Design a binder for this molecule. Structure first.
Ligand SMILES: [Cl-]
Ligand SMILES: [Cl-]
Ligand SMILES: [Cl-]
Ligand SMILES: [Cl-]
Ligand SMILES: [Zn+2]
Ligand SMILES: [Zn+2]
Lengths: 306, 306
């Protein structure tokens, strides 16, 4: 017995300077008709109102790192980070996280300065999320739509969409922070429409046959070359720059130092760098994430049991 | 009798999140040998230290709008904008503005999210600045190097380089704020080297023959389409996006509204839009600047009179 997804949210402005989500959320709050389907209506939400008003990523702390049960469960004070306070409000709205009152699904919208194109980031290999990616791929022949599987190191999930029972992040790049490109705005807008379409089909009892697909699974990060003071001593090499999801073999160049030397990848295996040179990641000490490209088998999601 | 340029500054980080200038200044402060020529040594300066540390454009007020004689001459208080306070310090260092103690030349480094490529911005048609552009063009066949003439509306100049007797801005895009691309870092680094080379030749008494060249002269700005509340109602049209310095004829599309309508250019004449969709300009109400492409005749700069 398939349970329909009836309480569905689309969050924009989780990071205040990521403009597609910001303006789609603002627009939908004024024009919700677009998020309505026969079986359900998705609720638009501006996730970080103060960061959005200020057009910056966050005020005190990254909102997308503030939604752990520890943060949500903590006893409020006045001296809490704004984003911690806002996380609690999203917990009331979309959760509480880990309980049966949580929303069925949260779609969280993101932009990156990296040349990722269309990427879905999933914190688990839940088969519904893989079918969703597959659906978007099929709906857009010739458009890459890649799934980046980013499982939490251990126990606690951190993100805005993790508040809901399930959720996914739709990330689109490249786009400078604080800039709204018409091309990415429209494309993101159409892909959200398609994601809602998919939830409707699901809700209507559509059978989703098992299938196989390539996904990219996180191996971990590589930091920028630094001085003994952790200041940049170089940046991403021109031959790596803008080459997200392309293979990176050992011995290939990954940085150019200001001194003019090349730094080479010293790994044992070919990997697939993603989120190469993202502005928000400098302070997280991440020049890029290494991923392994793996072919997974996705079980069927059928209305009835065969 | 030609006066040599002996007190020459290169400023980076005038805007704290414009990374080429930030990292070139930081690097040169550690490795000044690069800025030395036989006749002079250029002083590297991080223009906005606090904005740079915070990786944002400015703290209180745009530093590059804070260097008017009015601001510089004002009586200090504790409640002055940080950037006003910093402007006064740059006035002490590189000026005082309008006096004989000012530096001979300030080269101010900038990055834009607009697809400008290499642009020199000059606040006057001083012939030395035009020869400099011409020199850079000749030194880089096949590389656009365009001169954008931006004369102050009326009396008071506002910018960091206006503190010196003469100066120019070297702007390079596209680059997201807070991102350092190896390609733009290297190119900017080589162009600064060439600008210093040029000052050396000048200093050595080189004759600079009169010549003609196309420049782009500011006509003014066009703001983003807005609601009655001044919130975006659209963004730069995909056909205009990334087309800086290309001709824009009346009737051509300049915006796409969220409602799906196109907004068309209603001007009487063909213009050349520049700084199309710059992040820092949203709040200045500027989607792009209109310029006229005009061919000017540049007088000779000769060691002796013919
Ligand atoms: Cl499917
Ligand atoms: Cl990239
Ligand atoms: Cl010349
Ligand atoms: Cl542009
Ligand atoms: Zn984001
Ligand atoms: Zn700037």
């Amino acid at each position: 017995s398939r349970e329909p997804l009836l309480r569905v949210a689309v969050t924009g402005g989780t990071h205040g300077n990521e403009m597609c989500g910001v303006y789609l959320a603002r627009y939908w709050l004024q024009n919700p008709g677009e998020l309505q389907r026969p079986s359900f209506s998705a609720m638009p939400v501006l996730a970080n109102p103060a960061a959005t008003a200020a057009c910056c990523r966050y005020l005190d702390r990254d909102l997308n790192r503030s939604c752990t049960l520890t943060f949500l469960g903590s006893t409020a004070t006045p001296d809490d980070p704004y984003e911690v306070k806002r996380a609690r409000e999203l917990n009331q709205l979309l959760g509480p996280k880990g309980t049966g009152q949580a929303f069925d699904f949260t779609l969280d919208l993101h932009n990156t300065t990296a040349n990722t194109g269309v990427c879905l980031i999933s914190e688990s290999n839940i088969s519904f999320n893989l079918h969703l990616c597959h659906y978007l791929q099929r709906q857009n022949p010739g458009m890459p739509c890649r799934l980046f599987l980013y499982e939490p190191a251990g126990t606690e999930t951190f993100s805005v969409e993790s508040i809901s029972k399930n959720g996914i992040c739709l990330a689109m790049g490249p786009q400078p922070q604080g800039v709204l490109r018409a091309d990415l705005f429209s494309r993101m807008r159409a892909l959200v429409a398609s994601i809602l379409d998919f939830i409707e089909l699901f809700n209507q009892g559509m059978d989703l046959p098992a299938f196989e697909m390539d996904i990219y699974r996180n191996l971990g990060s590589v930091d920028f070359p630094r001085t003994a003071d952790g200041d940049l001593a170089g940046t991403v090499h021109p031959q790596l720059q803008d080459h997200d999801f392309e293979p990176l073999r050992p011995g290939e160049p990954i940085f150019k130092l200001f001194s003019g030397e090349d730094v080479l990848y010293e790994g044992d295996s070919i990997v697939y760098p993603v989120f190469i040179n993202e502005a928000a990641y400098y302070e997280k000490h991440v020049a890029f994430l290494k991923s392994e490209k793996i072919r997974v088998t996705v079980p069927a999601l059928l209305r009835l049991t065969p």
